[PDB]
Amino acid sequence: KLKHLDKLLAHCHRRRYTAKSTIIYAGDRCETLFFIIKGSVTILIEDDDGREMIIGYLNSGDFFGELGLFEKEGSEQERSAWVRAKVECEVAEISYAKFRELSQQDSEILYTLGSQMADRLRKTTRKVGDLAFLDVTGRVARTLLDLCQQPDAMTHPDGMQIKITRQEIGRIVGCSREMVGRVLKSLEEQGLVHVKGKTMVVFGTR
Amino acid sequence: HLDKLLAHCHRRRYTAKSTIIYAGDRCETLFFIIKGSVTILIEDDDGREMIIGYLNSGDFFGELGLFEKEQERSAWVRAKVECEVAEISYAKFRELSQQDSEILYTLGSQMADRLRKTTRKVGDLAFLDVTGRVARTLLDLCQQPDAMTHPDGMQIKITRQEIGRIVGCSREMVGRVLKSLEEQGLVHVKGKTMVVFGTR
Ligand SMILES: Nc1ncnc2c1ncn2[C@@H]1O[C@@H]2COP(=O)(O)O[C@H]2[C@H]1O
Ligand SMILES: Nc1ncnc2c1ncn2[C@@H]1O[C@@H]2COP(=O)(O)O[C@H]2[C@H]1O
Ligand SMILES: [Au+]
Q1: Which residues of B34-63 are buried (b: 16+ CB within 10 A; e: fewer)?
Q2: Cβ contact (<8 Å) for A175 and B50?
Q3: Which of A174, B13, B144, B178 is the most exposed place for a label (fewest CB within 10 A)?
Q4: Rounded distance, CA B110 to CA B117, Å?
Q5: Among residues A134, A149, A166, which one ends one of the domains?
Q6: Do A43 and A139 lie in a common domain?
């Protein structure tokens, strides 16, 4: 299961982050690995023009701040992205040093980190393909269907219910909020979606 | 640390342009590039390819299916040049890589570097349409070693299929974009040779 990380979680300070609080700022030094006990985070980078873009989300059981543990040519790395609390989050903080020791005495901790990193690489590579091959309408639709199969998605009698804004969809797909607003109203009249303010229901997805 | 991994690996060679990994296949084999270089490609449903990135000597590939317990190959791996690769079953690697953490940290370092590069590719792709992507692909190719100086700028040799694989669109879309880019005065197409103007 995940028992092998209990030796790790016993050596963790636990912090709380309210919604929208920034946990990691892109560009900083990397000395701390995080582990989500409760809540969820948003991974944001900045685009060619400096605009925010949402890459994805991490949830319970996920490590973050781990890419800085691995040094290209053996020297300091900086935080590759911003990690912001999406809802209220209880996270466990562990030093890179204590991790190296614990991943020294038990290699299944690296194996778990590797599984999570591999899945992130698969998802981000598909995101590359979505941006290159799909126009905005197809990207909004693929985002709704994708969020329906990720955690924090809700079973609805007519399908699934996800908690998300059109501003957030626009930052995910790479367009303005007013055009994602148009696409969402068109997809609604076509029977794919319902917008509910702070929640959207995607039909035919259960 | 070093020869101990390759000592339990079969040695195989792939000539240039040969497909080593087919996307969608079961993942049961881990690879290691001893010599050469490969291209990582994905496809859409219509069969259009896009180059995700490149791997070289000392890199593992075919590793993403290794951490499952039931996974299929995430992309096509094509030999860019001739490659000697070391192939090991996921099973024998898992056996040998139980306590040996100095190799798992190596795989994680290479995966972390791939994640940083691909995330940067995501940020680059967003908000640009195909015309903007073809245009920056041409300016990028103008600074490569196989490019040639032109009195009016830079001169590159590349096909519309190769541009289409860089930007992730069809060769016929690249042709339309190129005709518009000439109408903007940025490029001039001469069959298999293209001139990009005002590049510096
Ligand atoms: N493409 C991505 N997908 C998921 N998480 C990411 C991605 N890029 C960066 N991160 C996370 O964001 C963190 C920023 O700091 P680190 O580089 O230490 O570790 C990083 C990862 O936890
Ligand atoms: N974004 C990427 N960057 C570099 N290599 C990749 C990327 N995505 C997939 N790969 C490689 O392509 C392989 C395809 O099969 P695997 O998923 O087993 O392992 C994969 C990696 O070795
Ligand atoms: Au747009």
Answers
A1: bebbbbbbbbeeeebbbbbeebeeebbbbb
A2: no
A3: B144
A4: 11
A5: A134
A6: no
A71 and A12 in one domain? Answer: yes
- Look up tokens 């900086």; give the residue: A78
Question: Identity (one letter) of the amino acid at A78?
Answer: E
B118 lines ligand 2 (CB under 6 A): yes
Find, in chain B, the residue whose alpha carbon is nearest to that of A56.
Answer: B119
Method of structure determination: X-ray
A56 lines ligand 1 (CB under 6 A): yes
Residue B164 sits in the same domain as residue B180: yes
Domain boundaries, position A154: 135-203
**Structural domain count, chain A:** 2
CA dist., res. B33 & res. A203, Å (int) = 46
Question: Which residue has 């685009």 as its token pair?
Answer: A47
Distance CA A22, CA B175 (A): 45
Chain A residues inside the 8 Å CB shell of B27: none
